[PDB]
Chain A
């Protein structure tokens, strides 16, 4: 499918790589101050109504990175054909992100390679805590899927306002994903069914990590009192699973 990729050009260093639950939490908070709640209830409804935002992923020049789908992990013994199969299979297992080209292959369980240098570095300065040092023309992006009226109406106004540590531009972006019963989440999600393959993510909520596999799971949002909404919807792209 084709998407609107919200690119964050970083005017200075970041503290986290913000995944979808914290992105929506910030987009929501901006809308509270900028338009009041009536537009937050409307922002939620648009998202329950089918609209989706991905987690934030690394930005380099004209290269877009995406999360390695967990579907490949057990099927490494399929894209081989010992040392050249022991070492790589481990560095493939460890690899967190893929290029758009290699990610599109990973969905189809075709042979793919890994990004050599990932264009961000977690510096931990003592006094302690860490920042994220970005390369030149390198930053972070997240995808939006759904109607145009909602992007121009809610998301784009919210993101410019948030930028006022970063500037914002957006492009069209096609992801050639296979047709399948199973999909990869490009967003940390709160599942409704039991998923296929996953890594758990502790925040107190228990999320399914980015790259986890689901069979027709839209995820779900949660309302609670401390009202605030926690974004746990799936950003699904079709994926081919091995037999197992």
Chain B
């Protein structure tokens, strides 16, 4: 052991006594019961280092003696060193911040709470439900799985984080009412703040690390992502650019972790090309950050002209500013956000010459055999099933299980939403392959979705551990579960959505990107139209119905360029958010320009309109309701009649005409809705085109 690895693993196990107390195995208190777990685990398999980490769970009298009992030399540490580690880890627990069955209350809805289950994207969708008290029986089976995994784990933070995340993610850090924080997040945030204090140099303090600015909030946001990806000369390439921006991001984050001597625990989040790191406020750190920042920006300019920029800024911060005093953390994030907005308005100001089959990737040197693509710092060798992993760090895809890689490799698990319809060949489907598989008109569906007021949501979080949970769960819906929603899972939880066909077993969809709080997805226009509502329902369930999406849908000719498509759906998503939020841009629409008529629909408003009109004119699977075969012209005459309401909204001609046009079918349009006249809202006729034009597209 060294003092660095000890404090890291220390703060990461200060609260591994909470799962065993509630299991009720040892005599009593978690601080005591946590020591009797690690000391017990140390003896079995016979790994001495666990009995040194057991002290963290607990007038300095009995402690100095219990440390002296243990050999500090056997490992290669001082006694004075281990006292600092314990006092550092003790305070860290405070900075990251009752019954033995209370579950984890959802960050999204503190009123609702999570049923005990271990993190698995393949099975089930986390839905905050009723406050079901967790059995002491359940915590025992958990601790028995935790025991077995920790035994075979290689006692580095990179092999210990993956097991703590698997098991202790859906576990209340404290068992109070409306407790938001996951245990794993509180454990990884303490390991972060603790190691930050050690590197900061501060020692024997009990407020030189608390009231003194010895921490750095490092925040790095990519700018020009949209341009870098959706502005080229195919879908394969478009996918490759998204994957490459991921590896570039990891390369910069891992270099900051490497040179500051930190661990992945110090990464508060890395999602949507936006990363945050807690670190030390040493003259060494600020100097090393400037060198990393400078070289990263310079590489990005040589490689991609001015297309893709990386804005890296850091704010010095005290222990005070990690919590509440009358929200200092949010205000400290706000000062740093401001620093970023200015840096993004100084694109490449750090360059003066300006104004004159695989499982993952191995992070090796640039000059190395089999390097497929290069980052600003390192090269990336693909890691195949039958191959051997090559590099100091190994980025492994969609597993927390290290698998079969060397014991001397830094394990770095990365999740990427990468669902795709396979061709008649092993390769991914093209825009033509997807556009041809559509019910009716042969068009490519493009949908761009974004979570509403996420900036406000994250800004409400008091503590690092609150933000840690908020960010991880948020990112995990998109990276983890959008894969599942496309496959066809959560059918009960979603339910009846606007659809034009029976959901396929291998859907003609291709994820371009899904991560952070956003997605870009292409496929058969009708399958994309349905996925929009599936994703939104799953999202309403995944949150406590307390957060909303906005979506922009587009249906184009297969031969349309990516940049026009991306431009249209972006414009349509921007409208959806601007016309109030929690709404979808379903299709292009004619409207009066009197400022009373919106193009986007409220999700529930549209879902209600589909429920009402679709069954009366649509049989399903591309066919028109048997009663309308040869009476289709009626639907066009309705669109024709609606267009007269668009020309002048006040004139009633439409109400009387529609009447003679029909008779039973569409009783909603033959009248003059006076609630709409009162509330100064559009007449029902205005909204019909959202349903008809989709049906008319499906029946060609």
Contact = CB atoms under 8 A, between A and B. Distances in A.
Given A192-B355, A193-B355, A126 B348 contact: no
A194 B306 contact: no
Interface string A186-227: 000011111101111010001000000000000000000000
Interface in B126-147: none
A200 B349 contact: no
A136 interface: no
A126 B561 CA distance: 11
B338 interface: yes
B347 A200 contact: yes
Contacts of A91: 578
A124 interface: yes
Interface in B260-292: none
Contacts of B346: 197-198
A126 B557 contact: yes
Interface residues of A, number: 25
Nearest to B459: A82
Interface in B344-374: 345-349, 352, 354-355
Interface in B324-357: 338, 341-342, 345-349, 352, 354-355
Interface string A95-124: 000000000000000000000000000001
A220 to B, nearest CB: 10
A192 B349 CA distance: 13
A200 B348 contact: yes
B305 interface: yes
B456 interface: yes
Contact of A202 (B305, B560, B564): B305
A70 interface: yes
A48 to B, nearest CB: 19
A244 interface: yes
Contacts of A86: 453, 455-456
Contacts of A198: 345-347
A74 B347 contact: no
Given A124-B564, A193-B355, A206-B354, A77 B306 contact: no
Nearest to A124: B564
B338 A199 contact: no
A244 B355 contact: no
Contact of A194 (B345, B355, B574): B355
Contacts of A199: 345, 347
Interface string A63-75: 0000000100110
Interface string A44-78: 00000000000000000000000000100110010
Nearest to B560: A126
Contacts of B306: 200, 202, 206
A74 B345 contact: yes
Contacts of B455: 86
B331 to A, nearest CB: 12
Interface of B: 305-307, 338, 341-342, 345-349, 352, 354-355, 453, 455-456, 557, 560, 564, 574, 578
Ranked 8 nearest A-B pairs via Cβ:
A197-B345, A200-B306, A191-B355, A200-B347, A74-B342, A74-B341, A202-B306, A73-B345
